[PDB]
Symmetry: C3
Subunit: 87 residues, 3 copies
């Protein structure tokens, strides 16, 4: 999950884009990492309370995962738009 | 996750902004900023709701830190909304 | 609009407690505000201005979400307790490091 970031930075570097584009390409990937980290923290808290299933436990994890999904969608859109424009 | 509640209004506001941003005659960089700033609001709202779910999971008995966690989560949503408004204002002010 | 009113109120409570309770949060708040004001007065294009502002504001957003998580953990009273705080703090640090780099990249180009 950490190799994805490095690969993206390398691509952003290997690409001949201006500083602004490079910042957006990289920051969009960093945001995904941030959100995953926050989602995992919440999952850790849920599991801390106990292993017994609960409606609100699943809810918390679903909300967290949805946030990761939105961040990934935001990253894909970003890379699609800037590379379409670059080329 | 459960798009059948108050995530409706939040989510259509976001969705509508993405659609508007998709149609605007702006450069690529601007379009990305318009879309991601509203996208961030959705992300932060989702994380905020998740925290609220964990708090409610623990129980109904009130605790100072329970209210604090929820208050902190809301403040984050507020900052994200202010960031989106500022973004759209700065970028669109030319139009 | 009554929902937004109550939500605005929780928010102010959140900012207020964060501020009152830790100097580190207050000093971080000063830093962000100083960066927004500088960004607001720099001779840069609209796009660059937004990146300068949204990077340090993301820092504030992540700081608050992480603090929310700390509050939940502390509320419960713990290997996963430590793990939750660890994952949360990493998130804060990524946000901060990204803001600093973003500011260094952009200002080096415009200066
Ligand atoms: C009840 C009214 C709701 C209105 C929703 C908000 C509408 C905001 C902006 C509408 C203008 C859409 C953008 C049109 C435009 O810029 O065209 C792009 C350009 O390619 C035209 O050739
Ligand atoms: C953890 C450190 C936080 C520091 C927060 C306060 C410093 C933030 C940014 C410092 C760089 C901006 C200073 C350069 C500057 O202001 O140039 C002004 C420009 O208009 C001159 O023509
Ligand atoms: C021209 C090819 C460009 C290749 C790089 C495009 C990458 C765009 C978005 C990646 C953002 C996601 C970061 C990695 C991640 O955590 O997602 C993994 C998911 O399982 C699927 O992406
Ligand atoms: C999700 C399925 C539909 C496929 C669309 C995904 C492509 C990613 C973002 C599309 C939203 C922006 C469309 C507007 C547009 O003109 O994009 C091109 C940019 O202006 C230049 O790169
Ligand atoms: C100089 C910048 C001016 C921009 C300020 C625009 C702010 C407009 C509306 C702020 C949002 C109103 C409160 C909404 C809110 O409280 O968020 C919801 C809760 O935080 C969680 O649901
Ligand atoms: C002329 C540009 C200035 C106007 C800004 C246009 C709108 C830009 C960003 C709005 C994004 C916020 C939508 C989400 C939202 O409002 O949720 C509110 C909920 O009630 C909060 O819990
Ligand atoms: C639609 C009402 C928006 C309510 C919030 C207003 C306060 C927030 C931002 C004010 C924007 C001030 C003008 C920005 C502007 O002119 O951008 C131009 C670029 O900075 C060019 O470098
Ligand atoms: C448009 C820029 C907004 C950037 C975010 C502002 C920085 C975040 C928090 C600091 C501002 C919150 C106010 C602090 C506060 O409530 O003070 C309470 C009193 O000092 C206690 O009596
Ligand atoms: C006491 C701290 C208050 C913090 C200030 C928050 C203000 C946030 C955003 C202000 C909007 C930025 C204005 C940008 C601007 O003036 O553009 C002017 C351009 O030069 C016009 O082309
Ligand atoms: Na931001």
């Amino acid at each position: 999950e950490g190799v994805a970031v490095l690969l993206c930075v390398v691509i952003a570097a290997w690409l001949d884009v201006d500083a602004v584009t490079r910042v957006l390409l990289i920051s969009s990937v960093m945001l995904v990492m941030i959100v995953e980290l926050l989602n995992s923290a919440i999952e850790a808290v849920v599991d801390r309370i106990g292993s017994e299933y609960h409606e609100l436990s699943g809810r918390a994890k679903d909300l967290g995962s949805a946030a990761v999904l939105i961040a990934i969608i935001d990253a894909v859109i970003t890379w699609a738009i800037l590379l379409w424009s670059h080329f």
